[PDB]
A = this chain, B = another copy of it.
Amino acid sequence: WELTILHTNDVHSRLEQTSEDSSKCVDASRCMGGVARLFTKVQQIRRAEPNVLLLDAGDQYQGTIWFTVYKGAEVAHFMNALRYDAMALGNHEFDNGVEGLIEPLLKEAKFPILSANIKAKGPLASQISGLYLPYKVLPVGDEVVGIVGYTSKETPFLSNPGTNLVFEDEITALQPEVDKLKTLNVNKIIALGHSGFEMDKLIAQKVRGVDVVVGGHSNTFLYTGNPPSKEVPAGKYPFIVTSDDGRKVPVVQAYAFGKYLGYLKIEFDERGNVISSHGNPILLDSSIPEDPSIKADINKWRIKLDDYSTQELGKTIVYLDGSSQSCRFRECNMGNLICDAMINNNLHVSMCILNGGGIRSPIDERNDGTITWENLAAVLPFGGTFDLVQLKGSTLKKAFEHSVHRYGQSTGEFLQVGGIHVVYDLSRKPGDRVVKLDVLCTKCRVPSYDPLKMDEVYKVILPNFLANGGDGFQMIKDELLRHDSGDQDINVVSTYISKMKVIYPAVEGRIKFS
């Protein structure tokens, strides 16, 4: 018995087709993804194969002006039009609190929404009961397939789930659910969740009875053969994990932003044992036509959003590189721009720090340089604030050591800077990688760069996320000796662009490698 798993993850409000970098579609002929193109490819596989499952591994919420305006009603609507079979809860599903998950998605979806490790407590327990499930048994032709859900335990440190939700360890919470399915004679079991590739592999290893792991969160790209685009594979597709009980468990993910549609074909026997598995993510490029019916509906919903592109806030003559392969690895000019908007809005305060992972999209300069509220909404979607903090030289030094402590894994904590010249030597031990740290003086008439002093105290502009110890920056949370709340992150960057009129941020050497 053959099963075709079609899967998406970390779509992040990219309901419309995008450029290859996942920012707004400028050159339509080379545009990718979007739900209309996705609907065409799904329909094609559904005609060709009898046993198909369309699954989402979370983080449909947050990313573009679609979520800013419709707040998830678009997620429920277009995921229903595409006829998704199940969806696991992601951390961005809690960005608008539990209320913002319950009303526009949980109550509106025509498919089960899953998470076995999210437990409700207090006054919320009665309210959210039944709206999401730990598992769902789905009929697939003449057979039955069990789907178990999970969500990152990191969700309270990344989102706004509130005080009445407990995030248990995935493996601990999944084993009694899979055991329960085995007792009901459900011999075909999919773990569908949002915890990242490292967790996906451990679930595949330790959770007895799991046949396949369909994951997300870490935007992992997997491929067998020669990849079709810019994305570099982190492993073969599917990634094989040998479970503690000796089974070959396929582990899958399909990058992010709806650029690819994951496609895994599984061969099961009568007892639900995985005989074989093969496939690859399918690049949703312009070679696949967008569905005309879906595009017509997308275009109807577009009318309300056209108000966030009406006004040209300013222009860029440079590509604004806000991509994760740049901003989580090195100095990126989008990071320089935002840190310059931060320092300018507060002018003394000479220094700025900014987690690269907080930068959610690039902006393309080819559309006559035009920067709109919509272009900016994709770069900064969280609605955070840029705060003023006072830090010891030693604290700021520990933050920069933390910035590169696990360098190479595309992690969010890598800092973008303003009024700071940092030099890292990656060849050294984590916690001893900063080889130079020069800072811009405030207590001077002519601002110039001087070596940071451990026994000195500096005023840093940073997002509230970092001021509250986000991205594992516990030293900032624990050691800050002053914290003032500032202006809204999007309004800070918008006013600066308006004042500058024409912008051209460069990669200047604020961050260097030895």
Contacts and interface: CB of A to CB of B under 8 A. Distances in A.
Q: A interface, by DSSP: helix, strand, loop or mixed?
A: loop
A433 interface: no
A446 B508 contact: no
Interface string A314-326: 0001110100000
Contact of A321 (B317, B348, B446): B446
A384 to B, nearest CB: 25
Given A347-B502, A499-B501, A502-B347, A449 B319 contact: no
A228 interface: no
Contact of A509 (B317, B421, B500): B421
A498 to B, nearest CB: 12
A448 interface: yes
A447 B347 contact: no
A445 interface: yes
Interface in A402-461: 419, 421, 440, 445-449
Contact of A319 (B446, B505, B508): B446
A447 B501 contact: no
A70 interface: no
Interface string A42-59: 000000000000000000
A92 to B, nearest CB: 28
Interface string A281-321: 00000000000000000000000000000000000011101
B504 A347 contact: yes
A507 interface: yes
A319 B448 CA distance: 12
Given A365-B445, A445-B365, A446-B333, A347 B317 contact: yes
A12 B506 CA distance: 39
A318 B419 CA distance: 15
A506 B448 contact: yes
Copies in the complex: 2
Given A317-B347, A347-B317, A447 B507 contact: yes
Interface string A169-193: 0000000000000000000000000
Contacts of A419: 506
Interface in A363-379: 365
Given A319-B446, A365-B445, A445-B318, A440 B347 contact: no
Contacts of A440: 506
Given A347-B502, A499-B501, A445 B507 contact: no
Nearest to A502: B347
Name the residue among A319, A448, A506 with the largest chain B CB count within 10 angstroms: A506
Contact of A449 (B447, B501, B507): B507
Which 10 A/B pairs are nearest by Cβ-Cβ distance? A319-B445, A447-B506, A448-B507, A321-B446, A319-B446, A333-B446, A318-B447, A440-B506, A446-B507, A347-B504
5 contacts: A317-B348, A319-B446, A321-B446, A419-B506, A440-B506
Given A318-B446, A449-B508, 5 more contacts: A321-B446, A333-B447, A440-B506, A447-B507, A508-B508
